[PDB]
Structures are given as C-alpha cells and as structure tokens.
Amino acid sequence: ALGIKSCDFQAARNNEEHHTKALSSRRLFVRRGQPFTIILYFRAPVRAFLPALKKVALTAQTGEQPSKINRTQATFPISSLGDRKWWSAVVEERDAQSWTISVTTPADAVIGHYSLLLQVSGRKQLLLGQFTLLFNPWNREDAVFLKNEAQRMEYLLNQNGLIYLGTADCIQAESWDFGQFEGDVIDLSLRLLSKDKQVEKWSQPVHVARVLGALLHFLKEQRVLPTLLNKRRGSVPILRQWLTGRGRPVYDGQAWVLAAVACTVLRCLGIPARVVTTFASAQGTGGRLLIDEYYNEEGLQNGEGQRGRIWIFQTSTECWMTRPALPQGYDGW
Amino acid sequence: KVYVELQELVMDEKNQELRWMEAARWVQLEENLGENGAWGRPHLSHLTFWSLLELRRVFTKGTVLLDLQETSLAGVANQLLDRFIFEDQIRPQDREELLRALLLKHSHAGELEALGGVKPAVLTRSGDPSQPLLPQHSSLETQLFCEQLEKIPPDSEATLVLVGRADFLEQPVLGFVRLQEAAELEAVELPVPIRFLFVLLGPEAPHIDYTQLGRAAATLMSERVFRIDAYMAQSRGELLHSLEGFLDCSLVLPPTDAPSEQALLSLVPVQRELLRRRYQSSPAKPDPLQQTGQLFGGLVRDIRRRYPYYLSDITDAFSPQVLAAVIFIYFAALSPAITFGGLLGEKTRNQMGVSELLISTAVQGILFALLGAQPLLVVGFSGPLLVFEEAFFSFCETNGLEYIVGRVWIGFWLILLVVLVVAFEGSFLVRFISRYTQEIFSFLISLIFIYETFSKLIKIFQDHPLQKTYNYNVLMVPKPQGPLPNTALLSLVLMAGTFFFAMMLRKFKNSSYFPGKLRRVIGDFGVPISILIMVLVDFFIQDTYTQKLSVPDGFKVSNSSARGWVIHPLGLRSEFPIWMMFASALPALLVFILIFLESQITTLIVSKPERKMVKGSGFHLDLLLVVGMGGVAALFGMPWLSATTVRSVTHANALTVMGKAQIQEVKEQRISGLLVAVLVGLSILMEPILSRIPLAVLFGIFLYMGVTSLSGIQLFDRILLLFKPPKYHPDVPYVKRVKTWRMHLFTGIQIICLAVLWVVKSTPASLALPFVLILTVPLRRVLLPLIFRNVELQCLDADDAKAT
Amino acid sequence: HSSLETQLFCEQILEKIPPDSEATLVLVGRADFLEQPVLGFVRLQEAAELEAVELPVPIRFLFVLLGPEAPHIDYTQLGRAAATLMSERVFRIDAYMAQSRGELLHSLEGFLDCSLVLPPTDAPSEQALLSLVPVQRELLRRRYQ
Questions:
Q1: Full domain range(s) for residue A26
Q2: Does the beta carbon of B255 lie under 8 angstroms from any beta carbon of chain C?
Q3: N or C: which end of chain A has fewer CB within 10 A?
Q4: Region Dimerization arm: which residues (chain C)?
C-alpha cells in the first residue's frame, strides 16, 4: 500500500539553491555536502506515516559498478535520525499523498552521474531519477571551499573570462567565453574523466584536476595542428573538437588555449579555477636556470629556435583546493 | 468514360534502340504494365506530391494547341514543336532531336516478350539514348500492382500522354493538344480515336519523375470535370482553372508511423466534401450469445458463422503438428473410453460395456466433427455420466424396470428438451458464465483428473504389494489372481518416465537447441515419442507383468443374452410401464442439465479470445448435435456423450502454435477430431498394436495432460500468488489495480467454492454438482459486488484479461 | 467562412499524453502590414513551461507563421500542415537533431516524397480511402526502418 506514482526532483529550485541554475532548470545538478529537496508522490493515500517510513529506504549509485567499498553506492533510510554529514533523507513536510524529502550527500562524496533508487520493504528497486553531483566551493567542509562569495562568483559562476595576451609592457585583454555551463560541457568533462579508472578517487579534487589536466594536455598535443584559422569562440568549441574531432581545429599559434579549456572543465565540475598569464616565461629548461640565445652579427636569429626559449607569454591554469596529502600550509591556489 | 494511354521513351535491350512503349492505361481506373508484359490489376489512381507540383508549374507555362487541324502524329508533332519554338520553350536547334524522338516506333506491349524488355533512357543531342544519371526508382505501381478493354465506350475519344527525357533541355516543357476532329494515330493500337495529346519532355532534374508526371497528367485527363472543361476550353487559362479545382479538391495524406484502417476511415467526410466541391462547379453530376428473438435464430447464425469456413477446415490440417495431435488425442480418448466401458459393464452386467462405448464414441465423434461448429471439442463419456447411469441401473433394479429400455426413453425426452432450448435460444444463458465459474470448473476438473490418475497407481500398488515372498505360479487369466513381483514398481517407473519424457520434450519445443523447424517438429511429437519410448522399454522386459490395454474381440453387444443392437421403446422382456414413459422426463432433465453445463462451459473455455480463436464457436449448434446424438444413441443401447473439458482443452492445446510465450494461432480444422473418432472405432481391429501398450505409460500421459491443462487458468495463477511475496507478482491488471490482500481474499473465496464442490463430488449426491456450480453465478454477480468495488471485480473477473 | 475541419468534425487529454512528451506551439496569424509570409522555427535548448502559454507538457518547439492575405495561403491550413509535420516521427527526430535550416528542409522534402495525394475520384468513399492502405504501406516501408 506504498506504491510510488512519481518523484519530482525540483530541478529549478534545487539548482538555484546549489548555484547550478545556469546549467539547467530541468536536470538536477547538486553540489556535494548540501541538502536538496525531492517530492515523492504516492498512488494512494498513506494511512499510517510511521510504519510507511520504516518500510522505505533510498539508494544512491554512481558509475557502472557501484559498491559500498568504492563509496560509489550508498543506502540510507528516510528518518530524522540520519547523519546529515553523510547520505541521509528526512521527510520535512508531508500530506496524505506526498512526502517532501530533504536529501543530503557527504562533503567528500564521489562526483559524477548518480541514480536515486527507492526500496520499499518486500518490493523490487524503483528508480526515482537521475542527478549529477559536483564539488561545492560553498561548503566549509569541502576541499574546494572558497571563503568569499565574490571569489565563488568569479572563479566558478562566471562564463565571461579574460585571457591576457601580448607583452609584459603591452598587455591586451582578450574576451573569452569559458562556457562551463553549456549543456554538454558537464557531460563531456565527466566522459573524459571516465577514462580514469580510479573512480574511488573522484571525491578528491587533486586527483580529478591532475587526471583532466593530463588528458587535456594529451588531447591538445593530438589535435592542435601546425600552422579564419585564428578566429576563436571560447573554450567550448575547442573542447568539443578535441573530444569528438568535429569542428574547427586549433592551430599551434594559439596553443595557449589549453589553460582556458582546463579552466572551463574544472569550473564546470565545481573546482574553482582561473587562467593566469606569465609574460617572458623561460620554457623548456628542465629546471635549469639558464637560457642560451644565439644571434648573428646583424643582431638577428638564424634557426627556428632552441629547445629552451623565453616565451613572450605562457598561459596556465590555477585551481583552488586544499592539499591533504602535502605538509600543512599549502592550501589555496 | 474515356481511355488514356501513357507511353514513356525507353530503350530496348536487344538492339539498344530507343522507342516509345506503353507504361499504363486508364479507363477511369488505372492499369499498369509490368516487366513481364502483362497488365497489373486495375486500381484507383494515387499521385505523389512532387508529380502534382511539377505538372502545375509546367502547365502554368504550357503550350496549348486547341481546335488544332491535324490528323497525324507527324503533323501534330510539327505544329507542337513550331509553337514550342515560338513560345521559346525549346531552342530551334532542338527541333530536329525532338521531332526525331516524337516519331519513333510506338511499341504496345504485345511486343514486350518479342523484344528483350525496356529500360529508361534520355534522348541526348546526338540522338543517342544514354543511361540516366539521377538515381533510379522502380515504379511503386509496378512493385504494388504488377508483380503477380471492353469497358471503353464506342463513342469515346482517347488521350495519349508521352513522357520522355532529353538532356538537351533547359527546363521541362508541356504541350497540350486538342484536335478539332478526333483522329486515329499510329501510336495507339486500340481502335479508338485520339482527341487529346499530352507531351511532357525535359531534362533529368530533382523531384521530377516523368513517369509520375505522366501518371499525374493521365489521372487529370481521366478526371471527369477536367475532361469536360478540356472539351470546352478555348484557352490555356481555363485548363489552368480546372487544374486548380483538381488541386483544391485533392486530399494529401501525410506519412505516419501508425497506419490504421479506422484512422483512415475517419476521412470519409473529407473525401465526400472534396468530391462535392469538385462537382459543384461542373455541369455534370457525380455518379454468438446474442438473443435474436427469432425461432432457431441462434442455430442459423451458428450455421452461417462457421460453415463459410468449411474449406479451410480441411486444408489447414495439412501439417505434421495435426498428426501428432491426432496420435495424442487418440490415446487421450481411447483410454477413458476403455476404462469407463469396463466400469459401466461391471456395474450394469454388460448391458452397456466397452464395445457399445467405443462404437458410440466413434459415431458421435465422426458426426460432430463433420457437422459441429467447434471441431476442437472431443465427445466422450464423463464421470458424472457413469454416476447417473449407476443411479438409473439401481433405480431400475429396485422397481423391476428394464435398464436399456428406460435409457431409450431418456433420449426420446432428451431430444425434446434440446430442440425447445435451441428453438428459444436457451444457449444464450451461457453469456452469464464469467471467467469465475469457467476457471472454478476447469481447475476442479483438472484436479479430479490428476487425483484419479494417481489413485489408479495407488490401486496398482494395492493389487501387487511389495512383499518378501511371492507365489511364483499365479493364474494370469483373466487378470492375475494374486500379487506379483516387480509389477507395481515397474508401473511407477513407466508412468514417471512417460511423464518426464513428455515434460522434457515440451521444454525442448520452446528450447533453443537444434534447427528451429526440426526442433518444433520433434516438440510437437513429444507425447507420441514418449509413448513409443516407454512402450519399447516395457516391451523389452519380457518377464515382468504389466497391465496392458484390453479391447473387445469384435463389434458385438457386451451381453448377447441381454439386448440386441436396437431396444424396443415398449420393452424387451416385459411390457414397459406407461408411467415410466412420462416419468423419464425428470431424469432426462438432469441429464440435459449435466450435458448442457459440461459442453457449454467446455466451449467457453476452449474458445476464449486470448487463445486466438478467429473462426467462431456455435453454442446452439454444438449443444443440439451433442444432445440429439446422445438421444439417438439410446435407441440402440449406446451411451450419451458430452464435450469433456480435459480432452477438449488438450486437443486445443495440441493444435495451438506458439509465437516467438505468446499464442500465435490455433489449427482450427475438422480432420483431427474425425481421425481420432475413426481410430477409436478401429481400436477393436488394431488389438495387436494396443495389446503391447501398458496402462502406466497412459497414466503418465494423463498426468501430463492434467498438469498442462492449468496453463491459461488465472485461478491457478492467483493460487501461486498465495505462496509468493507481493514483490514478485507479475504486472497484470488484477495485480496492479487491486490490493494484494484483496486479491488473496478473492482467491480464497474461489478456494472455498472449490472445496465445497470437491466435497460434493465425494458424496453419494455427486449428481448435484451442476447445480452447486451454477450457484457460483449468483455469488459472482450478487454477493461479490457487496464486498468488492467495480474496478476490483473488473480486474479480477475479466472477459478477455483487460484492465477495465 | 468556417474551416473545413470545424464543419466536418465539430458540428456534432492528459491521460492520453505520454510522460516524457514536450509541446510544439504553432502560432498562426494574419498581419496585413507584412510584405511576405514569414516562418519562424524555434527549438529551445531545453523544454520550458512558458508562463504566457500554459500547456499540459513542456514546450521545446515554436512554429510562428505570419503574413498578409495572399492567394493559396490559408494560414489556418498552413498551421495544420506545420503541426502535422511535427507530429510525424521522422521529421520530429530530424528536428531535435537539426543544426541548420538545410537539414530541416531535407526532412521536409522526405515527408513530401512519402506523402500521398488522393485526387477527386467518383468511387465510394470507403473503397477510395481503403485503397490508400497498401500504397501507404509500401511508400512507408523504408521511412521508419
């Protein structure tokens, strides 16, 4: 006598509460460590609330082989005694035909695509719907926590960036569309992350940043071509072309866009990130603190160049997180 | 009316000479020419959107030659090309190529087989037909109507559409010519004058199919309103006006992924209104359980329902599955016949024995298969009938009445009742036997069958018990007078082995092993294969005694000193009393009630809509035939037979074909029952074959029939749900719209009825079973609504397993 | 004058809608100050419950058809044609995946190449309509494969 009619995930209101409204108003995007509200609808009125509450449990799974050991599968009841710092569910408001349920996730939860399943004593599992779990720069217990609201708005919510190019004495700001909230960017980022098989480490921003940074550098090496060709429309078309092979390729004169693409994928996953430009960067030294430049008697250079050169500028991605595996004091950028 | 001929420019295959060949022809209805050289079936013309959108564009800038003075294809072509060049439709350098094309040989079809067929082509500048460059599309009309002339009025005038492709063209061109006087042309072989000429030429452009373009032009000319306008048209503008009324009264049918007849029949008002608007501006005008109230009305409708299908009732049996079903039902009908014949014989001093029952079963089965409206029924003797007979043989033995002579009168009164019932359509009351009563009756009868099958083995174990020591010399004639070693255990082994082999072959039928055809052939013959295997197994064990099938010596009366083949309605030995002639009505009433309930409920069960019975069943005809044959049988001292539930269900199951779990079709035919009855009659002649068949093998076959008769019973399904958690219940209407405890209460109410019926069977008042069974109908239609809601009863007790 | 469908069918919903179903709003109007008829086709990035136009389901597609009075242009019938186009499965799939106008016109030409015209034929209505069943069945053999 506890058959479910439908489940409303309330994607608009939850996405507004979770700083995810720019992603969608129909798909549920939630940040780890923060409660979100769903409405459960019953086919028939529920006579006695307490036994019915005793008869139901909720399950959250992520990935293709969810397991309790991987922290990719969690089973929790619906009660006021649930651990709000872990997976939990409590009925906040109820009527005879519906339950308003507040669901929490741990601040160290594995990110990615999740399924919510309901188990009603003496019945088979029922899929309530899908949601995507992200890092939470707004939760004090998250590793990507940011102190300031203004820094949160700038390093995660802003799609309108500025990549600084030019020389040290003549800096030209180029408008850049990061587009982290574009519809497919989250799916593309999670698909790229799925090339890493240590899904249990996807709770760690450090591991996620390192895997995506390496994969994106590999893609940049594979897809950027030797030398309109320089017309750019932001990070999202570049990411689409790098992952799918379709679209306008990027040429080697604009290889600095790797930093912007990495910034876009990190920000879409919820890791605070910024593009930094260093002017007069000595690249290709291997740690050596010397640069050899060779000029002819006319003050000109003959060949294509050395391996160790001083670049006019170089772009880089900086990301915000704690460093639990490092000695104390290295949290931040 | 009028005749219209389309000819497309094509190349022959033998000499590669381009020429003109007919593609289709219209006398109101359109005929198409296939590649073989014959005409396809005549059909209403359907046009494509592109055909019509191109015609209008080419007709808007077309070249009209009205009231034209010519009587030759060459002259018409000359004037047409002249007015083409004058209107700048073609360049003057192309006049030589198009006049060469227009005056080629116009081959009718009579020469298609003489030549090597025709292929599409394009007239090129050099006059050489090359191969078209655009992708080809084989004609949909050819693919649909062709893969398999007296209607022309004498005063009608023909129209010839010529379609051809010529790369030497900037755009498609249309020349429409009306002659002042209708003339005969060398292009048309039919002796009808030609009035209108359609010439459609152009290059191979997108969305222009010239065959479809010519089809559209010919259909427009075949339209009455456009034809009448064209006869009176003095300008191109009037023809263009008539084409706008054609395209304004046309009905365009867009594609859909759900093609249906009912959805398409909703457009009837649209079609009629479009026709009305098209002809508004024209001068012309446009050219089984139902109670009828009629005496024997149900009988005639039952006769009119099934007898039209009589030819298929013989042809559809031409499959080995039918032969396997025949072998199955032969034993399934012969063994109960022999057992019941031996019992009644013993219980009636051989007045009615094995031979009478065999002959009656054969004759009644033959006449029912050849005449009945539901041939899948098996006509045989039932337990209730053995009980009533003993009831009468006792009553007659008490009151000094003759047995055979009284039963003779019961039929004389049986026929009176069934005739009045068929006359007033009393078989319409069977519409009130819902799935409740049907499934209670079927499940109870199946349980009785299983219980009797096991009790026969129990009796075998009692006759030859397991002992430490036996008498090695025990008389065997007629039956062993003492216990014998190895008999009961071998009987159990043979019965279990036959049942196991039958079930394993039934599994193998649905299995994924072997080629599908061979696997289905072997699975259909599962029961014959099991019977043969176990018969051979028992045959190769010579020493051990096992009880075999026993048939009488000949077609003679079972007691030659009691009665002959006919019984005198007035008495054999003593004068039969007058009062018993009138007093026989009440026992005849009970017999009619028994036979009616059995046969009607059996017909209901075997003809459920979910079994894919698409040939109909006659409640009035089958009842009449069965009860009349029973009444006639008596005059000859032979039993009254009825449609037994288990045998008929097994016959229907053996004739049912399974799809890829889902019932696909049923081999609804008369040959299987006819051959079963013939073999049952010939059982006396084939004693050497039957004498080597143990009863234990047939006991296993009986158990197989009993357990397989429970498939379609929803009561059996809901009983299994009593022992399943309410999580593994399947998604069916009575599960997902009824609470689990409500469904279990509903099942338990039926279980109460089953227990009440089963107790009554095991009492001396076992002839009251039909009335107590009828008492379920008030329970369902009166008491259940007092404790159930309408939706609950609709889901639980459904006519065709529908979710209300 | 009234529409043909109103005179033939009207003189004499949420249960039938599947659950993951979105809406198409076809807007049809006559504006005498426009030089030519204009078609606006909109696919939203995600389905949206527009407050101005409440529908049983979320809107993904908008058809806007406006223009002046012109010959052969019944705007009601044009809206009917656009709605019938959207109700067809192949065009609707092509419309969800379309990235340009050219793909949408290549879907519309396929629909017209699988569209069947019944001319005014003096046969009885039932036989004339039921004769379209095998022709449609053969014409749509490859469209939905």
A1: 4-134
A2: yes
A3: C
A4: 101-145
